[PDB]
Structure formats: C-alpha cells, structure tokens
C-alpha cells in the first residue's frame, strides 16, 4: 500500500 | 428650473462632495426633467444606491436615496465538493465580496453563476438558493445553499469510420475512460474538455504515425441522457490510404549549413510515412542550428501528397534567425531555496549566446527537482540593445517534508511494515535528511541518512548513513543463528555518461552473533577466525568489528521504468575489508537485465536476467557465514522455496536448550544422536550463479481497452549456489556441496499489474530439476510490497 | 464519503387493483440493452414478435405462447475467440417482409422475416439511433450527426441526405420522422421541427419551438393538417402543416413520445408528470404528480387505459377520464426504459435485461 | 469563536485599546474588524484603519497589513498621518524579506518605500530609522550580487563574473560586498588572459586596501 | 560529467574579416553585434571574446579587441585566434 | 512564521557604514547611476527601541 502525507 | 441649493437624504458612505462631482447637475443652473433623469440614472449606475428619487420641493431639490445595504458576510452551506476559500475567490472575482453593497436584483445572476460553475465542474443537476438577512445600520448577510446533485460520468466512447483499427484498441490510449475495473488503476470516469481535446490529438497522432497521411476527424458529438447522469462521446473520422515517403527537400536561408543538414534528412526509399519521425527530423535540424548560435531556428514541414502512386514528399523550409545574448538569468519566488540551488540546474550560462533548447532544459530540470509546484519562464528584452535578453524563472515553492507508512504481504517475508520521515530541502540548502525503518518476518532495520547532491559543482554527491539491523536466521529458512549489527557508511557518487554512474565509499560495521546451532560450516569459519567453541550447546557468542571499502557501477538504459520494453540495466557491486579489521575478505555481485522487443508495437518481448556472485577470504581466513549468497524463491528461481537452493546444514550431536517431546529437533543428543547429522535446511554458499529467460506476451482474455495494464510472461529459470571450501575428503559420506554442476531448473507462468493495494505479482512454476533437500513452492505471490 | 441527489425519489403509490393484471408469457433475450440509453424494443407483425439485444442477437417468437421461430446473431467474429458486439440501437421495424435495425457502427440491416438472413446491409453517415421509419418504398434514418437519410428498401442504397445543425451538447437519442401527404416531418437537436419533400428532400419550412439549456424534439405527430411537437426543456406546440406557423404554445416538454386520441393529448412531462391536455388550446384536463422523478416510459393506450412502466420495474395502469390508478403490477426487477408496444390486442414490453413480457388483464 | 457583543462603539473601542496596551493582538484584531464591519462610516473609521494596520503588522499578518496600507494610501492621499503609513509599508516589506542568497524583491520594495518616505518628508520622526534601514538594505542587495558572482566563479563562467562585478561597482559602489568582489573580477580577467584589465582592477584594489 | 560552458559573442570568422579601421561603433555593432564586455575604467574598448569548453574536451578562446577614439571611430584592431 | 516573529516583534540590526571608493591615478571608476542613493538626513531622531510605532492619536 504505502500512504504518504506531506508535513 | 433654476437651483439655488442642493440637499441629500440618505447619504451614509458616499461623500457629499463626491456625489456632487458625480452628478452632472450643479447648484446655480437650470434643471429639467431630462437632467433629473440623467442624475437618477447616474446615481443608479454608481452601484451603491438601491432606490433613487429626485423630488422637487418649493426651493430645494430634495433627493431620497435608499443606499444599498453593505455586505457584512457571505456564507455557504452544502459545498461538499467545493472548497469554501476557492468559492469565495470565484465570487470576489465575479464582483460580490465583503465591504461592497448588495444589489437586491442580482441574486438570480449570482445563483446562475454558481450553477454554471457547478456545470463546469461536472454536476448538471446542481441547484443554488440565496437567502438574504437584513441587519441594522443598512447591512445585510447573504447566505447560499447548494444542492450539488450527482455528477455525470462517461458511459461510452465510440469512433465511427475506423476500419483498420478496432475502437477498443484506439481508445485504449485515451485519457477519458468509459470502463474502470475494481482491480486496476486505470483512471476516473469523469468528463473534461481538456481531456477530450488531448484525446483527439492522441487519435490523430496514432493514425499519422502509421502512414495515413490523409487522416481527418470529421466531427465529434457529446450527448447526455435525459436524466443527465451519463455522457456519450462519438468521434466521426475519415481514415485514408497508407502512404509512402518518396523523399525530402530542404530550402531556405540555411546559412551555409546545407551539407550538415542533408545528413539529417536521409531516409530509406519505400518507407511508410510517419509523423513522429518528421517531428524528430525537425527537432534535429533545430538543435543543429542552435549549436551554431541561433536562438530561434524556425523550421516548418509541408507534405505534398500524390494519390496516383500514394506517395508523400516533404518540403522543409528552414529559417535560421538572428543571434541573441543573455545578459542575466533571474530567479524570483525562491523565498526558501537559496539562489545556487536553482542556478546549478541551468543548462544555459548567463553571459553567452541564447539557446531556447537550453532554456527549456533548465526549466525541465527545475521541474524534476521536486521543490516547486509551478515553474515559468519569460525571456524579456533589454531596452537599448536589439540583441540582448534577460531570462526570468518564476517558481512557487512546494513543501518538501513528509511522513510515510506502508504495509505489504508476500510469501517471501510475510507481513511487511515500513515507516519513515523525510525532508528533501533541508533549510533550503538542498541537503536531503531522512529517517526510515522496516520490519518483516526475519529482520528489523532502521537507518538515518543525510545526503548532499552537489558536493562538487559538476554534480558529484556525498552521502552518509547510520544503520541498525537485527536478523533472525531460523525465520528465513536457514540454519539457526541471530545477528545484531550496527554501523556507519559514507559514499561518493560520480555521474559520467548520463547512463553510467560510479560510486566508492568507506564503511564501519559491528556484528554480534548469538544462539548459533553447531554445524560444520559455521565451526569451520569460527576455527579460521581463531575461536574454539564447544559443539554441545547453542549458548554461543561472537563479536567482530570491520572497516570496508565499497565500490559499485550502474548502467541504466531502460526506456521506461514501469513495464519496460527495451533497454538494459547492469549493476556491479563490490566490497573488500581494508587492513586493521577482524575479518579479511572480499565480495562481488553482478546484476543483469535485458529487454529485446520482437515487434514494432512492442507487445511481444524477450527478457533475460542473470545474477552472479563470488566472495572469499584473504589472510588464511574465510568469508563470514552471514555474508553468504542465497538462491531460490520468487526473486531468483521461481517455483522453489526461498533460500532453499545450495548447501544444506550438517549438525553435531548437541543437547537442546530446553528439551520437550512432541517437538521436532535437529537430532539433539537427547534423541539418540552419536555422530554427524545431515539436514534439509539451507546455509548458503560463497559462489552463486542464476539465469532466467522470459517471454512477455499480450494478455489473452482481458478486454482490449485495458489489456496493456497487465503483463503476462512465460519463464524458465536456472540456478545454483555452492561452497568452494567444503572438503569432501574428510566428509565422504555426505554430498559434495562444492560442486557447481547441480543446476536447479523450473518453468512456468507469471502475471503482474497495479491494484488499489499496490503492485501485485503472481507466479505459478513447476521445478522440474531439483535435488535432495530442496523444497518446492509452486504458487508464489507479492502484494503491495516495494521495500 | 457520501453521495446525495438534488430531487428525492418519489414513493411508490399505494393503490387497490380495480382489476387483476396477469402475464401471458415471458421469454428471454441475451442481456437486453443494460445501462445504455437505447431505442431498441420489440415489434409485432402477423402474429409474431421480433426482438433483439445490443450484442447482436435477434429472435422471432410466436405471439401466442412465446415459442421461438428463428434466431440469428449479427456480431462478426474473427474465429472462435474474438467477438465484437454489433451495438444494435435502432428499434426493430417490420414492413413488407423485412426487419430493419440500425446500429451504433453506422450500419443498417434488413433481415428477412422468414429465415432471418440479411437481405441487405448499408453504411450510413453515423450512429443510427432512431427507429427506421418506412414509407413510400423508402427507409428514413436519423443519424447522430443530424443527417436524415433515405435508403431504398429493396436495394439499400442511399437516395438522398439532408443535413441538420447540431449544438455543442445535446441529449442522447434522435427523432423519428413522420410521413404525411408525401412529406416527412422531423425534429432536430437544435429545437426546430422541419419538413422535407420525400422526392428529393428539399426543405419546406423550419422554425424554432424552443424557450446550458438544451432543446430536442424527438418524434412529432401529425393529424388533420396539424403537427404536434414537444421540445425537451422547451414547450409543446401545435403548428400548421403547410407554413409551420405556431398556433398555440404550452411551456411543457419531454423527450419520450406522446399520443393523441380523439380530442385529447396524453403525455409525460420531463419530471414524469402524466397529463391529459386538449387539442383546441391545450388546457389541461387532469394531471398526476404521484410519480415525479420515477423515470417513466412512453405511455401506451391499452384497452382505454394508459399504461406506463418505470425504472423500478413496476407497470402502472391509469384511467383517462380522471387519471386515477386502476391497477399496479410488479413485472421485472431490472426495470423498464424503452417504450411498451400495444397492438392487435396484445401488450408486449421488454426489460433492461432483454426479457420480453406479454401482459394481459 | 471570539464572538463580540453588540456593545457601543465607545466601550468596544476602549476594550480594544486596553488589550492593545496589554499586548495581545489576536483579540484586538477581532474587535477592530468587528467595529469596522459594523460601522463602515463611523466617526473614527480612519483611527480604526490605523489601529488595524498596526495590529495586523505586529500580529504577523503581513499580507493583510499590506492590503490595508494600499487601501488607506489610495483613499487618503492627503491624510496628515500618511508618513506613518509609508513607514509601516517599509516595515512590512522588510518583515516579508525576513539569507542574502534568497529573493531580494522584498528588499528592493522596502528600499523604494523608505526612499520615498525620506525624500518626501525629511522632517518626520521616522526618517532616521528609515535611513538606517536603507543602509542595511543596500548592503543586503550588494551581498546578493556578490553571491551570484561567487557562484559563477566556481562554475567557470568568466564573462558573467566580470559583468556582475561591474554591475556591483555601478549600482552599489560604496559597500563591503563590492570590495570583497573586486578580486573576483581580477581573477576572471586573468583567466580570460586580459592582463591589461586585470592590472587596472589590481590598481583599484591596491589603492583602496 | 559536466555540460559545455559557452561565453561571450559568437564570432563566425566571416564577420571578423568584415571590420576595417575607420568604421564607427554603429557599423561595427551591425557587423558583429553588441559586445558582452567593454572597458568601464575610462577608455572605450570593445572585447569580443568567444570562449567554448565542451564536455571534458578542453577550453578554446578567441579574442578580438577593438579600440575606438573619442568620436567613436575605430582606431585599432587586435586579434588573438588562440589563447597561449 | 517562526522566522517571521523575530523580525516582526523586536529585532533590529546595525550594519557597517557605507564608505566611498578611491580611484587610482590615470583611470576612473564606473559611473554610479544614483539608483540606490541614500540622501543625507540631518537630525537625531529615535531609532532601535527608542522609536514608538503606535499610531498617532488621529
């Protein structure tokens, strides 16, 4: 899967 | 009617003097009905008066004006699929905003504007209602209620007039979609004018790249169902006959470069007309002229078509313009990133002659960096110089930090977890700093990495890494032992050919081994290392510190990253322990992959993979048994259980740590063990050779609209691993594990595609040449795992 | 994640069956039309019913017990593996020993009623989305391009073509011309009723009867020197047969057809509001707001009662004197999208899954 | 959400002043915004606007402060307290500028605003602060030019280096960056083998240092 | 490894033969172009430098120095085909 | 924000004085163009925490 969220 | 004084009733915000100036009438002049009407109309058009009444008293011209209530707030309700801020921006661009006055007649206009916006975004049944809440001091609040409705989706794409290519094959390359399976990632099924135009251009290119020089799109039609929940697209086209290319002709002010240009316009007689090739020829001529100082080398191609023979002859008109020199290159919008970060990506030098190709390449490199959302260029002129310009790059800065967390599954390692946090533009200096971690059945890994991508102006990179690793052998289909290691590593990176890349570096690693199962190979390495452990229990321990020199070379030429159809990739890696360390050895590995297409459409391909490896010790010692090479499994030889090929362990008679019947043990002393003991559990070897030949074919049953998103292959794999130090003379009763001739072979079928869970790979293979001890696993799969 | 709709679906009316309806027989055809908006529907001629599906299968059934007579598939196949659908969309027409069907591939087939063998097949300008009206030895076709073509029924060779304008965005489906006094009156996707002489196709008149707002006519009707037309989102109009000058207007329209009986006009509004107007001035005699947004089908006047299907699969009888429901039935689960066919004392209707039903009382 | 009661303007303004003196800006901004919204033409709308400019600036709401300053300048070109507004505009641009390698456009804007202030009203009370800020900004811009020339020196572009150092000697002749950059010009001239020009640059360097 | 570094004006070897003593600045600029370098320290002198250094192949430069007079009339021409 | 608060609230820095450039004999320096010129403003006003920026009472 792999979720990626920018901070 | 002469006027002696002027009076107003209702002026709140507009100044009295401003109103007097605005009104053409002035005190001390004749006034008539026409003048009164003109003043009334001017006041109405002022945009701040709702009702205007110019009445005449006995002597004074009294005016009654009901100033339009001021807008104090605009509220939205139901904008589920529309951002409130963007809706406010659209409204203020339209004209309605806070602070201004509200017109009690343009409510319908505002509602219809919002409905038009909804129609544009996709919803055709959307409705908008406006509510007005008056408030004291001539104020008002405007509230909007939205019934979004249900969006309309594409229900069919039809092409009428295609007799050589099927509609399914043609629309397979479009951006617009009419079918989306739940098991693929092909796209969304919405309708957009830009996508429709792009699809028309794609269809035109598809036909022009095949020799249909007379292709023409007669028309296009878009229809909605009466309930307005489905969209039908039709494209009426007219494909002609296939044409041949008779020849080419070049003319214009070539500037004395005719001899060099003719070589770019050489073709084989009898070739089929192509469009991509013609564009490439034009681009080649443009680059040729740009290399000679010309900033705008204009080129146009005109085809002349003869139907009697069905042949096309090109006519290329070339105009090499004038020479322009760049006086400055300016970057604006880089509030965070420093100047050099953007400047070092430029292919063009300030203070040299101009090149449009170079400017475009610099823009493309800036886009590839990843620190910006948008990049724009603007080649301005310099006043007072007829041949000088200033290049300006305008960038909007993105946010470069991120978190990521991922989950995958597979037969190789079971459930796999990944997590990390990354910062790609540390303080706008370009340094990339991150910390990552991974966990699966048999190991846990954590690392902290810091990289400088431009240690030298040419692009040489300098990176550093700190890592901790924990490895449990018995969970990986090997003989039991535990290895906990940690260390640091520093590396340089040299680009040399835009396909080739070298790297060299140094590293330090500390390894701590425990819980080692007594066996001949491990106790052969330990003796060379100087240890003399006992062979009756697995309460062991052994620690070593090593400094190594690392090197590698990579060559990448694959045309595409996902489902490549042509190219090669070669990766050589090495390592050698430099003096002063506990372990003296060297290790080398070589990866090869090659694709060869056997068609013009690149649907039938041949893939060849190889994997070689060899290592050994130097100062009378041996390579550590935890550096071994493993074969088997879906990575190397499909159809075999992971890490099953190669030598097998041979144990000593030893007492179990905590004996308990009903459990299977490796011939422990408490089960009647009095001599050496064979096994079926792999240990690896220090030499490895693996090869695989694969044939990639179109998927047979899947619908042709999306059959290019699934890859189908038939494969044949060979592999072998061996231990060159195994002395067969001493152990005569056991197999010779130092023979390279024990080749394991399997054959079968495999499928790959991208799913909502990530990449999916499935394989079924049948190992038809295997040796005693090897464990077969025909069905293998991997779900969403890319780490 | 959630979804919503602007207009709430109307509830199923509760009525007490004055009489009990039945279902004499039901036969199956392969997959019907599905979710696609098609004009395909069965036809009756000489005690036998012809049906088809979008894939290409065409069947003839006995009108009394539903027994199959012949069946032929018009889908071309490149061997035993490849099979591309014919995409049949033009309603089945029968006249003079032929079965005419249009196709989304700009093809018109004329099969034989006796054997099911293709008598001829012609290529037209575009998708044949309309019922192939037959008149005076000609077969009129309204293609999706806005072109009205006239084929020969015996040869199949196009005689004349008339070009009509099309807007940027339209509604799916096309109007079927009606022939009266040696002239064909048709409607356009731009909201204009036009008349063409069938000898060559020369336009006689054409006028706007319309109010992103669209306006599409879809099959006017002609009686006693007058032409009644409906434009979607526009207005009903009864115009003269010679000059085309509007006589009277009513701000109500729809895409599905309407019927004219005696001195009354039965139609279904865009919002599924059944009405019953008059011919003199169109003053409404009654209305039914019980089925709003139920997606009704074209009304059919069977045994003196209007019959309409709906997407949910229910078939409703409604009186004509006052408009009060006289019977309600549940027939199919897939629903009804295409018009019912009433003729020769029979009422046949095809569901979205191809199941042709014969209903009785 | 920081709801403001419909109290009389005098009382709400007194509360706003008290909170400004206390030193909390978030609530004072809400009070002043509510007052302005409810009384678009109140007796002290101009005072509300000035207090709002001050509060937006000191609350780090620089875009809103800039919008308010622009509106105020457009509407009241002859307001006696306009020099205060131009000083505030310069301060806001310096704050946005906030790192000499980065974008100098805000430094240029601040320099323009302070120059207009000092050249228009030399008898104002903000003129000394304006001049000190002008000196700082001129040095910052010279430093940006020096950074670009220094990058091109390592890139190896010897015409860009001399052109940029000449632009420095022309625009910013009296800063430390120019003195630091003169050797870069000499090196570029020598690398292109223009010893005649390198000698002149060396003469300047020797005569100055 | 690295890209190619270009600097100065592009001299074709035909334009340089087109300039003769006695020409004005306008004529010289028309023939060759606006120089990327002049002399800012008083005297008027135009430097036409043509420097190119392709990818790790070596540097080649040509220099053309044009010395005018107070009235902008060419007085001296100096040509260096290659840099020592 | 965090970088911006320091500037917006209280920070103040004093840079080096601007000094003229000498021209060796036999040559001159490039022209100045007066684009970035600081006029001399006499007077000793407030600066650097001694100047109050609160709006005047008008």
Author numbering:
A (entry chain F): 1 to 7
B (entry chain A): 24 to 810
C (entry chain B): 24 to 234, 243 to 392
D (entry chain D): 24 to 121, 132 to 242
E (entry chain E): 28 to 111
F (entry chain C): 30 to 87
What did the article's authors report about this structure?
The darobactins, a promising new small peptide class of drug candidates, bind to novel antibiotic target BamA, an outer membrane protein. The mechanism of action overcomes common pathogenic resistance and is effective, not only in vitro, but also in vivo. This family of bicyclic heptapeptides belongs to the biosynthetic class of ribosomally synthesized and post‐translationally modified peptides (RiPPs).
The cryo‐EM structure of the E. coli BAM complex was resolved with an overall resolution of 3.0 Å. The C‐terminal tryptophan is pushed deeper into the hydrophobic binding pocket and forms a closer hydrogen bond with the nitrogen of the indole ring and S425, compared to BamA‐D9. A side chain interaction of Q441 from β‐strand 2 is formed due to its side chain remodeling. Taken together, the different darobactin‐BamA binding interactions of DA, D9, and D22 likely reveal the structural basis for enhanced activity of engineered darobactins, which are more closely paired with BamA to mimic the β‐sheet prolongation and to lock the BAM complex in the inactive state by sealing the lateral gate tightly.
